[PDB]
Structure 1
Amino acid sequence: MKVQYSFEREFEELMSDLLSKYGYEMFQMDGLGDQLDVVKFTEDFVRTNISTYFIEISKPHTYLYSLYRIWQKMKEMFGKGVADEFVEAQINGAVYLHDRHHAALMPYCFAYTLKPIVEKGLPFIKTIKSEPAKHLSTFIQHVIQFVMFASNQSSGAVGLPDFFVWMWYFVKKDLKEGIIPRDKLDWYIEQHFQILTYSLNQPIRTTQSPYTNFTYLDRNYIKAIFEGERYPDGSLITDHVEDIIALQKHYWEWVSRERERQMFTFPVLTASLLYKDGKFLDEDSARFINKINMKWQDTNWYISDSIDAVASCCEKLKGRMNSIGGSDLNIGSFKVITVNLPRIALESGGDREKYLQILRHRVQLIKKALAAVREIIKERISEGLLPLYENGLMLLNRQYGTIGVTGVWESASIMGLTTEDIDGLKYTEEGEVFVDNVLDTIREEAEKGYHEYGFTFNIEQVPAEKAAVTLAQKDRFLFGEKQPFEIYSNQWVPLMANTDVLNRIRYSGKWDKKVSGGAILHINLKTEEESFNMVKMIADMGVMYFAFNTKISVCEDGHAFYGERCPVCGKAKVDEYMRIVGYLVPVSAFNKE
């Protein structure tokens, strides 16, 4: 059977032209080949559970639609040549549209404040309306319902950086009123940590858990963010800093225990710490995080030298945006489109000037596509399809359009600008200059973007879980032996490249600021003080987001431990949890993916 998809003939002609230029294999690589054949797809799938099938089946189709709609909007906004160039660039892998199956339908991510949930309840869920919570149990429930709702209204992370700020209030409320028996206080609190955590590790996105983030806000961040802000009882939140800190500590301690009973990925843990001139301004919290991380190293370190960006937070945008975690409160991205840097290397043939010309052009194109996607999102808002915006939870003016990068290293290598020395692999001095130039060029274009388009652009060295493979594959298809890499890197130095850790640290210290913390350094693994000094040294060097990695063992029943033998049930290790792209996941899963 043949099914008609009703495209404007110009798009049809484009698609035929591109299929004629590149061949069916390219489209197949892009996921617009046999994947559109529902019979083949289903037959393929039936040889996880059935609920997945209904998620996966339509992705090629909604990607195709999204691409078509983006092409329409871009043609409208910039003319046929630009739209055509973007489609060709997306299909052939010069760029990478993230969440492409969602791209014309809904936005990427946001790190929310729970203030509107606490204050208004759940009016935006309309099968049934909930009043503002009056108890801990229901605050927790509301957070769950909100996460489930938001996770199906966006493609990326649902951040909850101020969770404990608000949780504390209901803990105190229920303690005071005798809803929580005093002698059951600790059990209660931990029972609600547990209920939340487990719920956040259920398959609500069907195929997988939603992606959620928690942040341990240090005293500086709480004070800065919540200056002047009041709880429902009318009291100042800033008057309860120690209570909030203590509750955050309780969760982190609980987590660390609870892993023994059951390992879990979510929420991803970040600790946000103010650090300047060689010292933490909330040293007690830094030392706490340092101590608690000793066991599983399950928390990512976020370092900032200023709270100016988050000052009194609760048009040009300044707060940190990171796909892994550590996104500042009320910051997100509506879409990421990544520039394929190795492609430019391959196209450049070693000419750095050529490279930079092409790069600038591509980033201008990507900006145009982001602007288009933003217009489409505005259309969706207007059509009533995205109630997170209408209810003031997701804020469009607090969302960047993201210019993604991947394959910096491989790009440098193809250009002949990498080498080895006694310290291991590294950039040549000219290579380091080259990366400086690349990042600086992208920065300049991002900066001009705000005046060009009226919203703010950011840069991120993206996790690229899929893009890292797909782009390498496409480049390999187009350039063959010239592209020797099977996967592109999502860190300045490839994770699996024996190098001096000091050089990794150095490069992150040089380049994190250029992407405004849109990166991660994670170092695979003494005394507690040595750990603290290591942390300080890393922070001193200007690294903005980092973590250390252990290899966490798990048995078939999900108990977390180290070694080949479970201390709870005595069963054998059957899998590992590791931080591969910045959060803790099963290695079997990742390998399979």
Structure 2
Amino acid sequence: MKVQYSFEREFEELMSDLLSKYGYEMFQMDGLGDQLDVVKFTEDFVRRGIIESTIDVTNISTYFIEISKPHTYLYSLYRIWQKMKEMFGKGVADEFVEAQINGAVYLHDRHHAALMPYCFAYTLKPIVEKGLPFIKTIKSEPAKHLSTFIQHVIQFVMFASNQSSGAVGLPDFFVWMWYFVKKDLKEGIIPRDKLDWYIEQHFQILTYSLNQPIRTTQSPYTNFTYLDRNYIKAIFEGERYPDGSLITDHVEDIIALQKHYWEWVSRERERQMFTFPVLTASLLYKDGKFLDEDSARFINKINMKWQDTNWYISDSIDAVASCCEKLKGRMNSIGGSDLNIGSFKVITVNLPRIALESGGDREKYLQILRHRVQLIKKALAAVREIIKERISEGLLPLYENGLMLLNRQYGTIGVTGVWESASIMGLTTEDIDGLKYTEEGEVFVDNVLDTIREEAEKGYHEYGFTFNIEQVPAEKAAVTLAQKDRFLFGEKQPFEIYSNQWVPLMANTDVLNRIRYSGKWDKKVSGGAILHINLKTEEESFNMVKMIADMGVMYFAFNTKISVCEDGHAFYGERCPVCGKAKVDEYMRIVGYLVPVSAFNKERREIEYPR
């Protein structure tokens, strides 16, 4: 049966031509093949469970999310083409569509691309002050008590996760939670002899709610930040609680509450392992010292158990000063995005493609790169115009209620496969300290990133909004791009998956090289990357941390292999110390946050070896 979708003739001509040029397998690999066939999709979907049971469970709620993704992707691609045609001409639009489809670029959350924005790290201030104004079918009063505050936070997170594609960050959670803890303590709502119990009960309610998905089999991606004293002071200078008291008058209370959570979390994993919220600590570090060494030592000590917190290092708080037109502030897809910073969309450049296209010619490579990045900037501009259209149509209330801020969102140019690009270029080698870039290779990466940065900087004056760069997690992109490239270039592309760190996670190389590379290149993407290392004592750990910080790494973590039994208890080894049963899975940091390897491998294998 033939169902008609109504497109402009030129777009249909474009899609037909692209089909003739590239073949159905490209469209299939892009997600615009048999996936569009509702019957095939459904029939395949309803029997995934048997296969899962045979090889290794999803429920019906996943069906209703997934069925339409190909269709809303097709729509999004079309609308982006339209807007780009409007803004820059048909040539550019056609070029973009071709690049997206053939895999020269990777449009992130493409099924959402013309409908809602990517991500944001929120301040809860408007939640505390206004309640839930974005829910228009009932007027909700602002929270007066801790329980109602926790409720509102949970509800906000769930609401926001359906108005955006990516992370819901809450860097100032504990700032606002403290207020209600103290308020309820004062009014005798909380019996004093039950204070810590009351706090931990609310930690538990929130944390578990953020790991208990109602729809689909995955919770929304959330982040918590341990704000050091420097950050609390800089961010909340001048700000007051709803009782009129100064927030900066309560730095110690906030630090103490944050500390309580990090301790409670470390304890709780032995009862039940969980992913969210992803934990980052934001520390100001200058001239060989932490400016809040108490907090740094705390994070250092507490991390010894699970290494479940990511280290954010900065040398300045200028970018966040008095925060509560050129945009500054860190944007990172994994964690550590500064308060009131986000990205409305990421479009990634496939660097290995350029390697294959260039045939080892670095000058040609850089020309191609520049052009590609300019194209991406144009697409990001179109997307932004589309989001503004959606805001105007009353479809995105988070913008209307001052929670998501469009002028505080970057347009992001992503990169993936730096290593693989260099390798195809012939600019990598193995010496005594393991796998590494050749000198010429380091220079090449320098050039790639400096070029991208140059263009990103030009973008502000070109388009009116700020661009950033990120080495994206690319859980799916890293497979699909490599697949498209293999389909196009064959044996010349020998990699099954492209990398998302400057040197591959599982590379046989010296830690010092990794650290050095991140030290060189993290600043070029303004901290839009992560160094996480698979692996002494507390002071040895601290010395390592200081060392890594001195070397200029902006965001990093150490990885352990966290065993879990069938009952969910976290431990190390093959034997569970709580229940006595055997390890059956592990949690690890694979792209920057802690996940079960089994879920990761299910996902990877099912997008890498389909049908």
Of residues 458, 472, 485, the one that matches 2:468 is 458
Q: How many angstroms does 1:29 deviate by? A: 0.4
> Is 1:297–1:549's contact at 8 Å kept on the other side of the alignment?
yes
The separation in 1 between residues aligned to 2:480 and 2:431, in whole angstroms, is: 31
Mark the runs of 5 or more structure 2 residues left unpaired by the alignment: 47-57, 603-610
> Is 1:152–1:205's contact at 8 Å kept on the other side of the alignment?
no
* Counterpart position of 2:302: 292
Of residues 276, 289, 306, the one that matches 1:279 is 289
Per-residue CA shift, 1:31-89, capped at 9, x if unaligned?
1000000000000001x100001111000000000000000000010000000000000
> Is 1:321–1:517's contact at 8 Å kept on the other side of the alignment?
yes
> Is 1:148–1:204's contact at 8 Å kept on the other side of the alignment?
no
Aligned pair count?
592
The separation in 1 between residues aligned to 2:506 and 2:559, in whole angstroms, is: 13
The separation in 1 between residues aligned to 2:214 and 2:520, in whole angstroms, is: 39
The separation in 1 between residues aligned to 2:541 and 2:139, in whole angstroms, is: 49
* Counterpart position of 1:419: 429
1:129 and 2:139 aligned: yes
1:346 and 2:364 aligned: no
SS in 2 for 1:243: helix
The separation in 1 between residues aligned to 2:234 and 2:315, in whole angstroms, is: 13
The separation in 1 between residues aligned to 2:438 and 2:371, in whole angstroms, is: 26
Q: How many angstroms does 1:204 deviate by? A: 4.5
Per-residue CA shift, 1:129-161, capped at 9, x if unaligned?
211100000000000000000000000000000
Q: How many angstroms does 1:200 deviate by? A: 0.7
* Counterpart position of 2:539: 529
Q: Single out whichever of 4-13 and 199-208 deviates more from structure 2.
A: 199-208
SS in 2 for 1:260: coil
The separation in 2 between residues aligned to 1:232 and 1:200, in whole angstroms, is: 27
Q: How many angstroms does 1:571 deviate by? A: 1.5
Per-residue CA shift, 1:213-236, capped at 9, x if unaligned?
000000000000000100000000
The separation in 2 between residues aligned to 1:158 and 1:129, in whole angstroms, is: 23
* Counterpart position of 2:503: 493
Per-residue CA shift, 1:78-115, capped at 9, x if unaligned?
00000000000000000000000000000000000000
The separation in 2 between residues aligned to 1:262 and 1:54, in whole angstroms, is: 30
Q: How many angstroms does 1:181 deviate by? A: 0.2
- TM-score w.r.t. the length of structure 1 is 0.99
Of residues 482, 494, 518, the one that matches 1:472 is 482
Q: How many angstroms does 1:572 deviate by? A: 1.2
The separation in 1 between residues aligned to 2:482 and 2:216, in whole angstroms, is: 29
Per-residue CA shift, 1:259-318, capped at 9, x if unaligned?
011111000000000000000000000000000000000000000000000000001011
> Is 2:350–2:416's contact at 8 Å kept on the other side of the alignment?
yes
SS in 2 for 1:205: coil
Closer, same or farther: CA 214–305 of 1 in aligned 2, 3 Å: same
The separation in 2 between residues aligned to 1:399 and 1:492, in whole angstroms, is: 25
SS in 2 for 1:261: coil
Q: How many angstroms does 1:207 deviate by? A: 3.9
The separation in 2 between residues aligned to 1:516 and 1:566, in whole angstroms, is: 42
The separation in 1 between residues aligned to 2:432 and 2:561, in whole angstroms, is: 27
Q: Single out whichever of 560-569 and 423-432 deviates more from structure 2.
A: 560-569
> Is 2:61–2:215's contact at 8 Å kept on the other side of the alignment?
no
The separation in 1 between residues aligned to 2:176 and 2:599, in whole angstroms, is: 34
> Is 1:204–1:210's contact at 8 Å kept on the other side of the alignment?
no
The separation in 2 between residues aligned to 1:446 and 1:573, in whole angstroms, is: 47
The separation in 1 between residues aligned to 2:287 and 2:218, in whole angstroms, is: 42
> Is 2:130–2:142's contact at 8 Å kept on the other side of the alignment?
yes
* Counterpart position of 2:334: 324
* Counterpart position of 2:12: 12
The separation in 1 between residues aligned to 2:581 and 2:425, in whole angstroms, is: 50
Q: How many angstroms does 1:493 deviate by? A: 0.2
* Counterpart position of 2:263: 253
The separation in 1 between residues aligned to 2:264 and 2:70, in whole angstroms, is: 42
Per-residue CA shift, 1:395-454, capped at 9, x if unaligned?
000000000000000000001111111000000101000000000000000000000000
SS in 1 for 2:194: helix
Per-residue CA shift, 1:172-225, capped at 9, x if unaligned?
000000000000000000000000000111214534100000000000000000
Q: How many angstroms does 1:122 deviate by? A: 0.8
1:189 and 2:199 aligned: yes
The separation in 2 between residues aligned to 1:336 and 1:204, in whole angstroms, is: 27
The separation in 2 between residues aligned to 1:225 and 1:266, in whole angstroms, is: 24
The separation in 2 between residues aligned to 1:251 and 1:468, in whole angstroms, is: 34
Closer, same or farther: CA 190–163 of 1 in aligned 2, 3 Å: same
Q: How many angstroms does 1:392 deviate by? A: 0.2
> Is 1:552–1:576's contact at 8 Å kept on the other side of the alignment?
yes
* Counterpart position of 2:587: 577
The separation in 2 between residues aligned to 1:24 and 1:154, in whole angstroms, is: 31
> Is 1:269–1:325's contact at 8 Å kept on the other side of the alignment?
yes
Per-residue CA shift, 1:515-551, capped at 9, x if unaligned?
0000000011111000000000000000000000001
The separation in 2 between residues aligned to 1:508 and 1:159, in whole angstroms, is: 24
Per-residue CA shift, 1:534-576, capped at 9, x if unaligned?
0000000000000000010111111111111112221111110
> Is 1:55–1:207's contact at 8 Å kept on the other side of the alignment?
no
* Counterpart position of 1:220: 230
The separation in 2 between residues aligned to 1:469 and 1:325, in whole angstroms, is: 23
- TM-score w.r.t. the length of structure 2 is 0.96
* Counterpart position of 1:502: 512
The separation in 2 between residues aligned to 1:274 and 1:123, in whole angstroms, is: 35
The separation in 2 between residues aligned to 1:35 and 1:207, in whole angstroms, is: 20
> Is 2:62–2:215's contact at 8 Å kept on the other side of the alignment?
no
SS in 2 for 1:512: helix
Closer, same or farther: CA 204–393 of 1 in aligned 2, 3 Å: farther
Q: How many angstroms does 1:347 deviate by? A: 0.2
The separation in 1 between residues aligned to 2:138 and 2:433, in whole angstroms, is: 62
* Counterpart position of 1:23: 23
- Identity across the alignment (%): 100
SS in 2 for 1:574: strand
Closer, same or farther: CA 205–404 of 1 in aligned 2, 3 Å: farther
SS in 2 for 1:301: strand
- Dislocated runs of 4+, deviation >3 Å: none
* Counterpart position of 2:452: 442
The separation in 2 between residues aligned to 1:456 and 1:205, in whole angstroms, is: 34
SS in 1 for 2:533: strand
SS in 1 for 2:112: coil
SS in 1 for 2:337: coil
Closer, same or farther: CA 280–464 of 1 in aligned 2, 3 Å: same
Q: How many angstroms does 1:127 deviate by? A: 2.9
Give me the CA root mean square deviation: 0.8
> Is 1:52–1:206's contact at 8 Å kept on the other side of the alignment?
yes
The separation in 1 between residues aligned to 2:116 and 2:317, in whole angstroms, is: 31
Closer, same or farther: CA 394–205 of 1 in aligned 2, 3 Å: farther
